């Protein structure tokens, strides 16, 4: 079940990669018996850095950015939301 985690931006960012769909909407899908519109997932986690230290794992799905639910959101829409924050990032991530 999803966990809420805080990543503190270092000089070189949050140290993880997001990958997902380019266009809005998409098929409803179930993770751990729970239904969602398509989510972006963490495609890479920089070892020993920021996101890693925060507990984010590769293949984690991103459910919320800073408390904003982002299911069904496009890739551009999500990465924008992350980069909005000055100092830090609060992620609601979901493992599989």
């Amino acid at each position: 079940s999803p966990r809420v985690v805080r990543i503190v931006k270092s000089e070189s960012g949050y140290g993880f990669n997001v990958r997902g769909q380019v266009s809005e909407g998409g098929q409803l899908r179930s993770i751990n018996g729970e239904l969602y519109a398509p989510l972006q997932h963490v495609s890479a986690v920089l070892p020993g850095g920021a996101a890693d230290r925060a507990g984010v794992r590769k293949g984690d799905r991103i459910l919320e950015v800073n408390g904003v639910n982002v299911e069904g959101a496009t890739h551009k829409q999500v990465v924008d939301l992350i980069r909005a924050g000055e100092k830090e990032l609060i992620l609601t991530v979901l493992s599989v």
Binding site: G13, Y14, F16, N17, V18, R19, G20, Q21, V22, S43, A44, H75, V79, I82, R83
Partner: peptide, 6 residues
């Protein structure tokens, strides 16, 4: 379909 480094 697309990736970003953040």
């Amino acid at each position: 379909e697309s990736e970003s480094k953040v």
